[model samples]
Target chain A: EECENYFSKTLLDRKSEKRNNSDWLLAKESHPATVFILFSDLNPLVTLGKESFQQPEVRLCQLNYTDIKDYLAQPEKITLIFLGVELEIKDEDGLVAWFALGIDPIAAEEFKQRHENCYFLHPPMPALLQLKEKEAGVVAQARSVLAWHSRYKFCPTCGNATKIEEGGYKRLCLKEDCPSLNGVHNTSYPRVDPVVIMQVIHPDGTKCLLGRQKRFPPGMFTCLAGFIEPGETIEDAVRREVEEESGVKVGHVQYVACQPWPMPSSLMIGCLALAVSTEIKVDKNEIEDARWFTREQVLDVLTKGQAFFVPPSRAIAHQLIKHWIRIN
Target chain B: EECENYFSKTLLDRKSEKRNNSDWLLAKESHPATVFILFSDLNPLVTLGKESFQQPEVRLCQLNYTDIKDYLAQPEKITLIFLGVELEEDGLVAWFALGIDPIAAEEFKQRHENCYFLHPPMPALLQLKEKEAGVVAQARSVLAWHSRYKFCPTCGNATKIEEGGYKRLCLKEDCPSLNGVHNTSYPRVDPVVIMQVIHPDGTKCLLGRQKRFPPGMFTCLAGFIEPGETIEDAVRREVEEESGVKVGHVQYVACQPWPMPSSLMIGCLALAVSTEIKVDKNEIEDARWFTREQVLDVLTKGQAFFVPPSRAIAHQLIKHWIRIN
Candidate 1:
């Protein structure tokens, strides 16, 4: 792939691995892979709808798009993707590389379907990654597009019916009087429920966090997280959520990794926080318990060989704890 | 109107007027005396498209409500409003309250031929005083609803159109996904495109405000006022805003009653120092000097009296200035 420059960010922030955009849109002709699809059938059963790159590959695939732009333009277009992403890269080839589409990032999931024609294509996650680069890009595109089309079927104006416009790029309201016209995102804020999931750190470089939930499946715990509301600064959001959920006062927030998270297409912004004060005042309304595990205990849980995991998952929370144990 | 607790220093506040939740909404039952049919086969023209109110008489009419309440009950009944707002109190009470077939407002207008029907009846502005209230309220509402309804016919989402929704109220504003539901207002504000219509003050107080094309008539210089903006702000907006000139603090001389199915026209006089006239056709194509002779000629023209849409505002604007001069 030729080197490129990413412009200043607006709504979608660019990331490396979990990145979804590519040059497939720079096509001279329509192709099978140009159609992005998302597998939402089994999404409900997956890892809490969102995940980080460090959060297990979770059976996801990334493809080199330029290599596959030609062949998939076959007559028999392949359709149906349960969970995936297809980026119409916006670069110099802009009209050439216009972004294909975006997803809500939250409700994206995999669904169930049966078709003998569909074979068990597997490199597994890694093999799935190696599928013909062009063909793989097609698979990813179909998934994202289908997912977006499924969500918006009604008009926002007058609550009347609406249909897609601008070559399937947007949905327009059918009402005679609505103020909005051609574009979808033009009118909406691409409502990505912001979640600032912070892993708290104490002054002495220790994990100052505990977690619990109603459906923990027993002995399993993770870091505390909450949604950000309107009229709130990100820094303040993290501080407020930390204090409210765990009774842990996080006076400072440090930035961390990001993921495209196109399970539906959201930019997950992560952070590391400084616990100003630590107390066990769990807001039971949303959370169940509040307790901090030491490096030793957290170490035991990560190995599973030590003891049952107090916090389990191939999650960053697990990796983070491991990093602390090894270093501290 | 039951002693409107809002204004204690009554500058002729409607608070003193007994607010008869009394059904002013007249039924299809004809009360010609109460129904002032100002338009004979044709109505007075007013340029507009702004939110407006209907007088209290229409809201409290005891004779025609049973049908209104009955019709309003069913989801399908409220659907009838788009057809037009005609049914009398009985028709209204029958459908909204009495559980009967609801006749659409416009359908009701067509149904009654000679009953002196109000084409676009003023139902909400009834809380104020009785003097020429219905006329101003009607003019205000009709124009406002027109501007807000503009939308894409295919998507229902708001689409840019001429006159800003003058043609249709886009169904999109009501979309479940959209946040600004743009509800019908209560006690709508009086937005006027007024200026002192100021001229060399030592002499002429700018006698007229121009209306649009197909000329012959020039009414009080006016346009629909916007929200969060004040009446004086409207004056300046009309002046420097449209005509490229600044106007200072305006003193509201009086509000005249005008009913033409669309506006609660508020009239006021603005004081300005800069003696410059930059006529913006988008606002007023021509605002010029006119002596008392010209003013009298336009006001008393036998053919139409410069027939500016009358209710009371135009009448008073001309009358008050003439009296002052």
Candidate 2:
């Protein structure tokens, strides 16, 4: 199934093959019709409408090259990432190209002060979820690449400065003899860590397991999630994580849906795992509490508000639960 | 169905919970019963059996802790990884992988004439029994990660290996990674999508070849799962980008941990909505759609173009599609 999860929808055609074409990228950079998205400290710039304070209609603000040319002049101080070209929107100049500019903190403050309607959304959760599906996808791609650039300024193999290549997708080591410069270097590319987030089903099939970390809001619970380690399959990771976090042994696992969680670039592989062992032995180190919620209780939480709060629809955990209940 | 692909089976329990327990790990490190598997530059040390001429039965050579303790003392030069404890075994015998320095590796090789290191660990890795291949997968991947990430990506400073070589930590007090649960601290497992693309009519499948593959060999179209992509989207994007075949519904078939430097191959079967083949010249040398009969012949009689060997996930993906139909 094509999971139309928020942050998974895109109207842009990612022209990956053209990433190496410097001349085309240069033309797009100076084009009058090119659209630019601004991010500062990983938070994207969004415009709030009149109802924003109450109902929050957040739209990702689009800036022109002319609007932010000064910041673009100093390339070293900022990261310019080529997002893609709009699939539908085009002009006499051809397809409208999109770029994400990650500016320094000082420049971000100056830019924010200049524009009244534009605000850098911090704690990007609830407000980010408010964006349209397509915009959310753009945010996902932009934020992930930008975040990678910010973190990896030096080579992991050799502790030397690196230069960005392939339109922010790759970082080449400056050192001549670095091993990373050799055959098929994965370290040079943007990393998308695979994480398994699963909804464990009770043996009875009428209930599902949910756990809440101490950091989560008062009574909120969500799916148990962990990173896929080296030498582990998606299935084994699911089984291992579920067992470790909740002490529940999984029998059969089925992939449900996936979401590109751009809180520093993680591919959340969602699954429905059948629990063979139901005893709740919560790993206090991992989560505060875990409990099996009945179908009726979960339905009440999804529809009429909760005995305990579930994640919002933007999260894959929410969709996993909704999918289990067979709710539209 | 459970995938029993090469480098996928494990007899080890992977006692991850015990990784943090320094005392327990220390005890296992000194225990006489513990088994040590050695690697030099990612090549596993193995011994060939007498039946090797007709049918190669490769056995991974197991060394003792006492034999390699001197190298373990100088932890800075070598990478020692904890594979896991053998499951359902008495005495809780643990398995460890040692990445030996070239000089030490040479000396060790000179001492042990019966065993030799397997170079270019590909097709040769397929020779080992499935259970031993799993240990090699775990060891080589973690060891490769250590080799690549000697310095922290966040800070350019040299890092310390911790948590039984499963993690690396930057000692710099000011480094941001030192403060939180950063990804830089852990090993990386890149997820790749390798799919068997079937035509809409379901009578034919698409296969492509790179210049690197052996002549007349075509396998499933594969690519690394890019950032901000779901598994389904990755499969569709890769198929379309490489072969210009628009894929419709994608079903997850099976997965394999291909530890040629740590990658989880997410094997899948994709239905091609568009059957026209236009190979991306830069990436794929050639691509073609073959009828079910042609694929069946390749599998059964080895008459058609060579597909990947049975050890590969691509071969498994192709075999799976044939069985389903």
Candidate 3:
């Protein structure tokens, strides 16, 4: 495993006992921690001062209950997610609990106007990826959950407003005895879209396949990835996606690792698939180009790229490609 | 992959084109295919009087649109999933899927002969290998989602199935971002992390039993992957919550699609940092450490202990931990 993969570590201990009960976030204590208001838009409030070469110069505005409740105490307006207790808290009584407030689009825009340090200038994900792993992981969690909370204000079963419960872990419908309350549906839980990001190897183990989406930067390609359909394994997702995008048949699939991609809550499940057939038929609908790269070409691209580029180092695709290059 | 594993190989080629547009499901072709009515009560109507030892003996009743509309025309009561096209059939003979309405399940059961509602016990689920098991799992998961997602979360209005039964449309015109093409209803697949927590010394593994499980049945501890947490963290938290076992350096093993209302079982292997069994009564009924020999006995013989049914991901995780098929 790489020493510094973004969005990997978490410092908060989600006190399950608090979530099990109703009022985990409303506890009257000196344990005031932090609140990061993520936008429906891809922007975030990043500070510009004190830039360091070692770490990404991005930090979410951290504030306690006094800063929030004293001004924006409109509990009805904000969706609060109990971001768990800080693990490094010195004393149990002095333990701090972080919370993420998901603001609506209009309100987010207004806040952007009000706050000077905040900027919607660029997508916060790539910027968040530049931070320390632990910080990046926490920000990813906050951003993803906050994004979900913003959209899922109503129950899918009853179309009624859902009240926040379990410190943002659950959102129960206002309608009592809703159909989703039955064992069939999860009335309200955080949604994580699982995606298969595969590094497919050629039959001879000499080449690996990569594809370029239409939106990707010019001359850049990455490992094929797609959202996993329901009732499919990681292996099957890998095969189906590879087949769908590049028309390559995958046989043996091995599990590699997982990364939490917070661009609206997706778990990037990395895998290695051995291709039984290597013929490439690009699905122009999904990707613009599909091609295979020999190990030497990949190595050259990684060290001294001349022709094409892969995803950023923080991305699971880059890790997967690097791992494949070294192993092969 | 056991040959008789019920939830194994499914041959349905999920034509992705069907999901891209709304008219593919209604193509004017004489495509007739399979329908498995999964009950909310966990009973599926499998074929009766067929005692095939090699096969699961459970086949989804094949039906075309004509049959579906003639018998049961109500889309609200029945969810028809497009479970991909049947392979090697002449020109798009697709599988037309349907899930059972639990309230009227008894009435419907009386109508179909040569079939009986069978609870998927260990033996029944393990009856089929790859394709059959895969189909069953796919049917179960999609049907479960359809039954649950009847309303729109955006506008608090009802939802209707569209895009060849793969996507759901919010009925409200005012639904924010509800352009008829944008999918509001998604087939939710919950990822659950189930791990066999091995002791630090690697001689023993932790197993826990919930109150609902049959007496003397112990399996791997599992919990849902919450928003914002990684699979590794979910595994660590679930183990600690269920058995008070702190884990370190977790590794991903394999994943299985468990369709008990659609959960993607992420099987993992973890080395425990601590082995002290402090069972959270709310989560785990009982949790304890079992030596390698004891696990072997449970797997090979049922005289001493009983693990989960062979059909479950727990069984798979246990088997993987012991390095046995």
| Model 2 DockQ, alpha carbons vs. true complex | 0.77
Categorize the docking of model 1: incorrect
lDDT of 3 by residue, A21-41 (tens): 554345632245454444445
- Whole-model Cα lDDT per candidate? 0.39, 0.88, 0.72
| Every model's TM-score on chain B | 0.50, 0.96, 0.84
DockQ of each: 0.03, 0.77, 0.54
Model 1: fraction of the reference interface contacts it also forms: 0.03
Candidate number with the higher lDDT (2 or 3): 2
Task: Candidate 1: give the TM-score of chain A.
Answer: 0.59
lDDT of 2 by residue, B215-302 (tens): 9999999999888878888899999998899999988888799887889999989899997888889899999998889998899885
Error of model 1, residue B103, in angstroms: 27
TM per prediction = 0.36, 0.96, 0.89
The reply for model 1, stretches above 4 Å from the true place, is: A1-145, A166-169, A182-191, A303-316, A319-328, B1-325
Local error of candidate 3 at B231, Å?
2.0
By lDDT: ranked, best first: 2, 3, 1
The 10-residue segment with the lowest total lDDT in model 2 chain B:
B48-57
Highest-TM-score candidate: 2
Q: State which candidate, 1 or 2, has the greater TM-score.
A: 2
Q: Which lDDT value does model 3 have at B219? A: 82
